[PDB]
Amino acid sequence: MQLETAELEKGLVRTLVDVIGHRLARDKNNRPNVIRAYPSDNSNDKGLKPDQPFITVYCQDAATPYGWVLDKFVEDDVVCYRIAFQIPVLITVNGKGAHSIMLELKQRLEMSSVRDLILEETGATVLDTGAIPNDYTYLNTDFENSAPLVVTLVKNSVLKDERGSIIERVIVDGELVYEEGQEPPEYTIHLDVDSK
Amino acid sequence: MRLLNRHSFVVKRKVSEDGYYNDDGDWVASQDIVEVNCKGNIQPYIKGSVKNGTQIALPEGIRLTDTRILYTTYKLRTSDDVEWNESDIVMIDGHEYEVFMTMDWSQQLAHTSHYEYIIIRRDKMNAVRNSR
């Protein structure tokens, strides 16, 4: 499995539709309003703001606090590497009662279930979950209630080194001497070992 | 002139100028308040970020701020610490408007000498007295 935030966001979006979809608004296709941040298509088209309440998913960054390389192994003749990653994600609810919805979303991510569905879709484990503020932003006319939350994930990624190769034959030479630097060696041992 | 006297309003002048500080340090406003009748002209004040009848949204609720400009031949006065007197009050629409600015155009010309004032609607607050 390779690590790609584009897939983690999609998996989280698909999971949230079932986990917390009953509290959200629904579009013309009856689907709950969960979307990825900064919507756009065809390199210039821009999405419209859905009907409230809705959810936004945005991946912040990715780091490797756990060393630099976790494993190096051979799976088939191609060499492989494994690396441990950490990915903080930001989920926000916009509308009225955003805090009341974020609280229930928090209380469900900690269940034994749900954490299995997340791993089934994204193949990642939930590591931490931060606090929830209760924000108000003026916009125009009326304030909008919002409630962000940060959910950190952990995943292992594997890549293939197509430039690598393996050793399958070894040739060894040796000598024996009574004294250091004895120019004609007392004995010479030549060895050759094949994998087969 | 006719246009300078289109509107009639009431002015509350604190005739006495004996305001002082109590033995406890609190302020005590001048006691003798007197009502008067005056005539002038009132228009909205359009300049910069001035707010005429602007609704303001706050976490505590809603406010309303207003301010106007007044042309008149009557000499109203604002607060002055050197002369030790307080400002006047102008009643517009039943609410109080405190005189904050003045512009002295008097003694300039015969038929067009007058005054200009900027009056700001007083904010709502509860009352307390400290009189000694």
Side-chain angles (χ1 to χ4, degrees), chain A residues 1-27 29-195, chain B residues 1-46 48-132:
Chain A
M1 310 204 68
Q2 255 210 65
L3 169 67
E4 294 201 37
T5 64
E7 284 303 319
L8 262 62
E9 289 178 316
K10 291 170 196 161
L12 291 203
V13 166
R14 284 187 299 253
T15 295
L16 292 168
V17 168
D18 282 28
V19 168
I20 199 68
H22 58 286
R23 296 287 298 284
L24 306 179
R26 313 173 83 87
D27 62 14
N29 291 47
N30 207 27
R31 184 193 167 266
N33 275 341
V34 189
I35 58 160
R36 291 168 69 216
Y38 309 91
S40 147
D41 186 31
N42 277 295
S43 94
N44 263 109
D45 306 345
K46 278 165 300 221
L48 297 98
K49 176 167 168 167
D51 308 71
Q52 291 101 324
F54 59 86
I55 288 179
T56 298
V57 185
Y58 170 38
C59 171
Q60 300 192 347
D61 65 357
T64 54
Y66 314 122
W68 47 91
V69 168
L70 191 73
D71 279 17
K72 164 153 82 162
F73 61 104
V74 179
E75 151 185 30
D76 206 350
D77 277 6
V78 65
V79 180
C80 300
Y81 293 75
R82 192 172 283 124
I83 300 175
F85 277 106
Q86 193 174 260
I87 308 98
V89 174
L90 182 73
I91 311 175
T92 309
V93 170
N94 294 65
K96 285 193 174 185
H99 219 248
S100 267
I101 294 168
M102 201 35 68
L103 261 286
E104 189 189 318
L105 180 54
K106 194 153 211 273
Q107 283 166 107
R108 288 189 186 284
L109 291 166
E110 201 155 337
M111 271 156 198
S112 62
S113 297
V114 185
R115 279 196 280 104
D116 64 296
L117 186 57
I118 292 162
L119 187 139
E120 177 206 300
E121 260 94 349
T122 65
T125 60
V126 177
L127 172 69
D128 231 332
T129 311
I132 310 155
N134 189 62
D135 299 340
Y136 278 72
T137 36
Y138 182 58
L139 311 182
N140 298 345
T141 307
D142 313 329
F143 296 89
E144 175 165 63
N145 186 47
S146 310
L149 173 66
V150 173
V151 180
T152 82
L153 306 179
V154 163
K155 185 176 179 78
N156 284 313
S157 59
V158 171
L159 277 177
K160 297 281 168 33
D161 186 6
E162 39 271 10
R163 297 157 181 143
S165 53
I166 63 176
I167 312 197
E168 278 205 316
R169 190 190 206 110
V170 184
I171 295 159
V172 182
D173 295 51
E175 313 183 52
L176 302 172
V177 300
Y178 295 120
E179 301 135 10
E180 192 48 288
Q182 188 189 322
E183 184 81 1
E186 257 291 280
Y187 221 83
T188 61
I189 165 162
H190 180 275
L191 179 65
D192 191 11
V193 185
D194 278 307
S195 182
Chain B
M1 90 200 168
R2 314 181 51 51
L3 198 47
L4 269 172
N5 307 133
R6 180 56 178 83
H7 297 162
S8 49
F9 53 86
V10 173
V11 178
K12 294 192 241 293
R13 169 166 282 188
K14 319 191 181 301
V15 161
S16 193
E17 315 173 15
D18 68 356
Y20 62 99
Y21 283 92
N22 276 353
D23 293 78
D24 202 308
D26 298 334
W27 172 252
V28 174
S30 83
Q31 292 64 350
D32 313 318
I33 278 154
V34 172
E35 284 54 15
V36 186
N37 289 3
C38 294
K39 314 212 291 303
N41 196 286
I42 302 149
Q43 306 173 10
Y45 186 47
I46 308 314
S49 307
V50 167
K51 304 206 183 314
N52 328 87
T54 279
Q55 163 194 310
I56 298 176
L58 294 169
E60 297 131 14
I62 284 278
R63 281 173 59 224
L64 180 134
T65 37
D66 179 78
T67 166
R68 280 147 142 133
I69 185 162
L70 161 66
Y71 301 81
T72 179
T73 58
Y74 295 63
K75 165 137 138 173
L76 314 185
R77 61 151 149 59
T78 191
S79 302
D80 192 336
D81 68 327
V82 173
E83 259 173 313
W84 204 263
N85 50 48
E86 299 107 310
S87 35
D88 291 349
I89 305 278
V90 175
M91 311 306 308
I92 271 163
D93 249 354
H95 315 270
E96 282 176 350
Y97 284 70
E98 161 156 50
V99 178
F100 259 88
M101 255 165 271
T102 176
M103 291 155 228
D104 194 328
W105 292 106
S106 73
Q107 303 264 70
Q108 206 83 70
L109 278 181
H111 300 294
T112 300
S113 281
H114 69 284
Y115 300 98
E116 281 146 40
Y117 303 101
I118 316 304
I119 64 186
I120 298 175
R121 191 198 198 98
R122 272 181 153 198
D123 291 331
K124 180 192 78 196
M125 212 164 170
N126 61 297
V128 184
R129 295 231 333 287
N130 324 297
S131 195
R132 164 63 66 248

